[PDB]
Amino acid sequence: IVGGYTCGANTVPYQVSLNSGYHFCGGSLINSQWVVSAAHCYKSGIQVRLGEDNINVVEGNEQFISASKSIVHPSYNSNTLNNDIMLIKLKSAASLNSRVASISLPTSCASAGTQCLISGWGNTKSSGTSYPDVLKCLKAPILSDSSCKSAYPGQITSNMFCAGYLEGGKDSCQGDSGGPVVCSGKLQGIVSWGSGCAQKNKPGVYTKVCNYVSWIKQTIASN
Ligand SMILES: *[O-]C1=C(C2=[C][C]=[C][C]=[C]2)[C]=C(O[C])[C]=C1C1=[C]C2=[C]C(C([N])=[N+])=[C][C]=C2[N]1
Ligand SMILES: [Ca+2]
Ligand SMILES: [Cl-]
């Protein structure tokens, strides 16, 4: 997260870190045995880490659970990143409390102007790599579709939305991929891509979760 602030230990209880010997992506806990992340974060050997703040220190509240299976959306396209969403089932259920909790799925899509919270342990520099130890947060608005399409002409599908600041300076970045975009207490987006990080006129692009709620529900229901 570039231009963000320190969230504070466990203030974002649904945030998870996907780890394969190091943190490579974020994710959101939607129920005690399922996490939602981005399809481009897929790999084998994933350990889901819940209740984290400082990812390099065990401080208490952490639950490390291995992934039992990862379900990348069948229509995921790695070239366009359309349908960039993945579900991970946990080997055992997590213990939920106030430090580890699930986030609700939306009932409706959000509208431009809605203010959301984006979090993660991704890079904090737009020009260079600086990865933090603790979780960073950023409050950003969802942009209108015209502004999004005008910034990324021909690359935005109906399963994507832009959120951020056209003036540059504040944005999500690599290491944040797979994590949450929560608005009014509902998971509305998944950190997916962008051109560089925090560049002017190049907002972040997120997977539009409201378009996948029935898919998520049906898939969990059958696995
Ligand atoms: O997400 C990501 C990855 C990545 C690939 C495969 C597994 C995990 C992570 C790699 C990468 O370097 C090639 C860059 C990203 C990445 C860039 C970026 C930018 C923005 C933005 N500008 N808002 C958001 C998210 C990401 N992810
Ligand atoms: Ca820790
Ligand atoms: Cl277009």
Swiss-Prot record:
Identification of the protein by name: Serine protease 1
Catalytic activity: Preferential cleavage: Arg-|-Xaa, Lys-|-Xaa
Binding-site list for Ca(2+): 52, 54, 57, 62
Stored SMART domains: Tryp_SPc
Keywords: Calcium, Digestion, Disulfide bond, Hydrolase, Metal-binding, Protease, Secreted, Serine protease, Signal, Zymogen
Family, as annotated: Belongs to the peptidase S1 family.
InterPro entries (UniProt xref): Peptidase_S1_PA (IPR009003), Peptidase_S1_PA_chymotrypsin (IPR043504), Peptidase_S1A (IPR001314), Serine_Proteases_S1 (IPR050127), Trypsin_dom (IPR001254), TRYPSIN_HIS (IPR018114), TRYPSIN_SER (IPR033116)
Bound cofactor: record note: Binds 1 Ca(2+) ion per subunit.
Record-annotated disulphide pairs: 7-137, 25-41, 109-210, 116-183, 148-162, 173-197
Reported cofactor(s): Ca(2+)
Superkingdom of the source species: Eukaryota
This enzyme's EC code(s): 3.4.21.4
Assembly, per entry: Interacts with SERPINA1.
PTM entry text: Subsequent cleavage after Lys-125 leads to alpha-trypsin. Further cleavage after Lys-170 yields pseudotrypsin. A cleavage may also occur after Arg-99.
One Pfam family here: Trypsin
Gene name of the record: PRSS1
Subcellular location: Secreted, Extracellular space
Record lineage: Eukaryota, Metazoa, Chordata, Craniata, Vertebrata
GO cellular component: extracellular space; serine protease inhibitor complex
Catalytic residues in the record: 40 (charge relay system), 84 (charge relay system), 177 (charge relay system)
GO biological process: digestion; proteolysis
